[PDB]
Symmetry: D2
């Protein structure tokens, strides 16, 4: 469970950064 | 932008799958 | 923990649908 | 599209916060 939660956390954080990039590009 | 959005949304769908498995394990 | 996981699951699923909308609109 | 993306990314940031709390509770 620990490893899976860490991976979701990582990916969610990356999404914030990617979506902020998209917002700026749009 | 379209390709990046698709990668993000596919990962969001994987999060549903992973969270559902965490629910089962808990 | 159960209630919080359910809410994240719900929201992730909604994001798939919203992001697929954005993909179509773009 | 920009407003919707902002709502999504703000929720992604909340998921990091919520997942981190779940880690602590577990
Ligand atoms: Zn995400
Ligand atoms: Zn991702
Ligand atoms: Zn992921
Ligand atoms: Zn499953
Ligand atoms: Zn999401
Ligand atoms: Zn949301
Ligand atoms: Zn949420
Ligand atoms: Zn916290």
């Amino acid at each position: 469970i620990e490893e899976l939660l860490r991976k979701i956390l990582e990916d969610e954080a990356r999404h914030v950064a990617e979506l902020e990039d998209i917002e700026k590009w749009l």
